[PDB]
Amino acid sequence: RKRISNCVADYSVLYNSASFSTFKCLNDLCFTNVYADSFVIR
Amino acid sequence: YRLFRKSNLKPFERDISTEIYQAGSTPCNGVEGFNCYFPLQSYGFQPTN
DSSP: OOOOOSOOOOHHHHHTOSOOSOOOOOTTOOOSOOOOOOOOOO | OBOOOSSOOOTTOOOOOOOOOOOSSSOOSSOOBTTBOOSBOOOOOOTTO
16 A cells, blocks of 8 residues: 555546556546556456 | 536527537547547346446
């Protein structure tokens, strides 16, 4: 769990990256934290 | 039914057309996928829903 707080999370660059596979969901919304996970699936 | 619209359709305004929509910056140019979806979706009326 990469939970983060008080960071400027730029979802637009990530969302508008053209280097992904699935964006199953942003910069106008603020949240307490982002439980950003990390793993690889087949 | 319409899902992806650039703006809010005006009152009594009929967006009578089926044009492929362009979401955030990933040029579609006639294809669907990454930030590219067809704005008119078939719902499917099953009476037992």
